């Protein structure tokens, strides 16, 4: 009980593996399952039975026995073989699901039964460690050197690279502080390059205002009740306002587009292209607000603290819908799904395309008045913002690959030239 925090930290470290070695482990054990030829594995049944066991809140010896039972029920020859191979429909391993749910007891039982911690599982752990549930479990605050965005996350979350560093850092999971800073700086930079774009000077005032009022450290907002009084106040005044929004282990997108200054009506733009959304729903949903005043300081505070306070995906969504008046959205911008990422850049960024669309509907006098010429205008504006990100990241990469010609080398070669044939690419001179 007093030894569990340190014990579990040690076990994550003992069970750490590199992605390829864990993939060999999975392959090895899938070959092993063909020798016994038993019931083929059924992952969806394993997780169904898994999520039911965890709610019983049983203790170790009990849990290991039921874990074995439901493993064998699901076509796995052992609990260890389930924990190593099973993934759910969102692509989570059981360890990674336990940690994302901030369920540290069940995560340690998984560790006691052979679950392995690959990079993903460790980068979900690290997001999970900055939360109240982690504090009540006995975990310390996170080391302060984990506060700079790793080069592998900086270039990978923007360009689309899905690699890993030599130190084991994934390119795919990020804290809300460094990634919100980077979305904010990347919008001010675009506004400053296009100073007649009246849309993006307002988008930049919203991002600058909310990055300053939220005051995120790692993934916890620091100025806790005030940030919501301050964001609600800017919405009641009729200004564009991004609301940082999250739940346990996952970042969404949320902003408010006013009809105009002093006006009390407008639009709520929600974005989720990852965990929590049913595929058909991937992208951005626009709700018409006729009484902004359901967007309360308490709603705003709950949004910004969802991950920290342990809020589930469904708890946050119920709130976003009641602040929109329990009405259905009036539009859905279908956007690409994103798995194995908390979507700290992806859901922020795609939300901007629904801002543009609200600023175009606003200036046209409503969504029912948009022409198809307006949609292509919106998509061109958006795609011009994104192409500005990609170019400035590539130019950042090439230049940096060269203030140091020895992870940066992988970052360029890997995915950007190996999963992106669609693109003026810059070389890697050898020294």
Residue numbers in the entry: 19 to 424, 426 to 442, 444 to 451
Provide text from the study.
A Legionella effector LegA15, also known as AnkD, is one of 11 ankyrin repeat–containing effectors in L. pneumophila. The Dot/Icm effector LegA15, a 471–amino acid protein encoded by gene lpg2456 of L. pneumophila Philadelphia, harbors an ankyrin repeat (ANK) domain that is known to mediate protein-protein interactions in eukaryotic cells. LegA15 is a GTPase with a unique catalytic mechanism, unlike any eukaryotic small GTPases. Here, we show that an ankyrin repeat containing effector LegA15 localizes directly in host lipid droplets (LDs), leading to Golgi apparatus fragmentation of the host cells by hijacking the host vesicular transport factor p115.
Here, with crystal structures of LegA15 and its binary complex with a guanosine triphosphate (GTP) analog, we showed that LegA15 is, in fact, a GTPase. To further understand the molecular mechanism of LegA15, we solved its crystal structure at a resolution of 2.59 Å. LegA15 contains an N-terminal ANK and a C-terminal domain (CTD). The CTD consists of a β-strand lobe sandwiched by two α-helical clusters. Structural similarity search using this CTD in PDBeFold online suggested that several nucleotide binding proteins are structurally similar to LegA15, even though their sequence identities are less than 10%. Isothermal titration calorimetry (ITC) experiment further confirmed that LegA15 bound both GTP and guanosine diphosphate (GDP) but not NAD+. The disassociation constants (Kd) for binding by GTP and GDP are 1.38 and 20.5 μM, respectively. GDPNP is shown to bind a positive-charged pocket formed by Arg291, Arg408, and Lys367 without inducing a large conformational change of LegA15 because LegA15 in this complex is well aligned to its ligand-free form [root mean square deviation (RMSD) of 1.0 Å]. We overexpressed two LegA15 fragments (amino acids 1 to 192 and 95 to 471) containing its ANK domain and C-terminal unknown domain, respectively, in HEK293T cells, and found that the ANK domain but not the C terminus was colocalized with the LDs. Together, these data suggested that LegA15 is directly associated with the host LDs through its ankyrin repeats.
